[PDB]
């Protein structure tokens, strides 16, 4: 009925833990996001080439 102090102890601990976990999760979420952006880049680049090549191909066709 006044172990309040101890719960103040523990809650402060939980907060600190949860923030850490949030940050860890956010860290992973941002890294994957970068890994995703790269893939999109690559896709874009590849599309570029296959439409450049193809365009040149159509110049040779008659």
């Amino acid at each position: 009925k006044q172990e309040l102090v101890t719960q103040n102890e523990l809650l402060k601990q939980q907060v600190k833990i949860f923030e850490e976990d949030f940050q860890r999760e956010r860290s992973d979420r941002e890294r994957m996001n970068e890994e995703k952006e790269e893939l999109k880049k690559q896709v874009e680049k590849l599309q570029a080439q296959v439409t450049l090549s193809n365009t040149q191909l159509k110049a040779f066709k008659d």
Partner: protein
């Protein structure tokens, strides 16, 4: 000797320990009783976090002392499991987890009994007794879950 591990809720575990046991050992015993991985547990005594490599006697923990346990939201490694219906679930695992314990975590998360679970990675069916490390399963790898009648 006995120690008591209480949580914010009030749930209290009793453990048989030795003063020379480490905080890692106490966490392993708590995993044996409650199924909580040690990298998801914080132990507190006298208002401070206990470090895994120290012993109970290192921290002045005598018999029938009481520690406090706070559960983490996540551990150090997650993998993804994709279902036939296209659902993605995320699992807390350890590199030494057996495939059987991965299936048990899937049961916890999704309710599928392990005997119905078939996990596939890199085109290979995973054997129950082997670990994630045995198959070179890394963080954020994707397993594929299929249900099967283990008898056709």
């Amino acid at each position: 000797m006995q120690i008591f591990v209480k949580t914010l809720t009030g749930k209290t575990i009793t453990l048989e320990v030795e003063p020379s046991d480490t905080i890692e050992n106490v966490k392993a015993k708590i995993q044996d009783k409650e199924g909580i991985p040690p990298d998801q547990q914080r132990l507190i005594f006298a208002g401070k976090q206990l470090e895994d490599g120290r012993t109970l006697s290192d921290y002045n923990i005598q018999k029938e002392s009481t520690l406090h346990l706070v559960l983490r939201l996540r551990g150090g490694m997650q993998i993804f499991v994709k279902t036939l219906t296209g659902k993605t679930i995320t699992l807390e695992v350890e590199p030494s987890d057996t495939i059987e314990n991965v299936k048990a975590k899937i049961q916890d998360k999704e309710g599928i009994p392990p005997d119905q679970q078939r996990l596939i990675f890199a085109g290979k069916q995973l054997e129950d007794g082997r670990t994630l490390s045995d198959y070179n399963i890394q963080k954020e790898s994707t397993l594929h879950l299929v249900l099967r009648l283990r008898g056709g």
